[model samples]
Target: SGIVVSPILIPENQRQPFPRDVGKVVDSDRPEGSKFRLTGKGVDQDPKGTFRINENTGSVSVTRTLDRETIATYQLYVETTDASGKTLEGPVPLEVIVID
Candidate 1:
């Protein structure tokens, strides 16, 4: 009957490559056939558009390299809803921290 949100963490200065897969966003209260949407300053609205989410699976991925010095962390907002547009919960905060 309520929403369940989880946190996301990422190490800083990853040198692998672009389009790095970060992690998944989970909502234990999410019902079947529900969809996910992500919004935040450094997420879908970023100038570089560094992050992306899978509407169907709630998976989040970074589209470019990351620098802890430039940006140490990110606060992402998550929301879930069914086809009827009923929100499962209020906006959930997902913190993406870049560590050394």
Candidate 2:
């Protein structure tokens, strides 16, 4: 079965405090065991290694390694997939800014 994924949208004002946690909603239509992924870009040309997403909840989390000095702002994208390695949907835009 195919997974119906939704886009994650974050407002520009929400992108503050640099290492902030960007949250999004992703619903899967595949199966209960479908594996989901949240990927991003435009931070360092390749998503930040400190960023992580929960497979079961589609929640995006940031690692302690992230800081405002390194990334003052992040314009990224998010995507999700099914257990079979198929893209469910997305490439949703996320904007994150840094704050003192």
Candidate 3:
């Protein structure tokens, strides 16, 4: 079966001293024992490692503070697979924005 992964959207104003909770990469069609992962230019380029995803729940989150002056946006990639190691979906682009 195929998995449907939704795009991640983060508001610009959420960052820093109060790092905001972004959201999850939803997989409504995910199989019962499926796993999720997030990667890409955003994750690799990030010096602070600001992004994280739950392998089981597909929940995406920001683990550090963001600075609009330093970096105003991010381009992330996501992927999903069964427990046996099969690509279900993605390597898809998900964008994040940091605003004033």
Candidate 4:
């Protein structure tokens, strides 16, 4: 079994508007380079593929583009895995809101 400690939710910077960078924090007992799989309502269909989660830091980022008009809120799921791809426990809800 695995566990997820403190789960932090972060909102995208409203100043940047669409195509902006967004991030989130996650704390886990897993080691570095662990695979953090993030899936959610908005991310699954994201065309730009801008969403990414840092394996080491457990931070979520948007490397491509984001549109506030099109996507204002995102329901994210974070899952952490070990080297063997075994489930270390995760799949938390992360809500990302874009406020102007």
> What is the C-alpha lDDT profile of model 2 across 1-100, one tens digit per residue?
3333333333333444555556655554545565556556533356446556667776666544444665666665655666776865665665555454
Best by lDDT: 1
For candidate 3, the per-residue lDDT at 84 reads: 78
Q: Alpha-carbon error at 56 in model 2, in Å?
A: 1.2
- Stretches of candidate 4 off by over 4 Å are 1-21, 28-33
lDDT of 3 by residue, 1-100 (tens): 4444445566545646643457677776677777987776556564546787779877778766657787777788777877876877776777777656
Q: CA lDDT of 3 in candidate 1?
A: 40
Q: How far is candidate 4 from the true structure (C-alpha RMSD, Å)?
A: 4.2
What lDDT score goes with residue 47 in model 1? 42
Residue 85's lDDT within candidate 4 is 73
- How much lDDT does candidate 1 score? 0.75
Q: List the residue pairs that clash in candidate 3.
A: 12-99
Provide the lDDT at 12 for model 3. 49
Using alpha carbons, what is the TM-score of model 3? 0.73
Sum up the clashes in candidate 4. Answer: 1
Q: What is the TM-score (0 to 1) of candidate 2?
A: 0.56
lDDT per residue for candidate 1 within 3-56, as digits (tens), equals: 455566777766766777778877775678888877887775664477877778
**Descending-lDDT candidate ranking:** 1, 3, 4, 2
Please give, for residues 1-100, the per-residue lDDT of candidate 4 as tens digits. 3434343333434334444435655554565656777776655665535566666666676644445676676777777887777756677676666554
TM-score of 4: 0.64
Please count the clashing residue pairs in each candidate, in the order shown. Answer: 0, 1, 1, 1
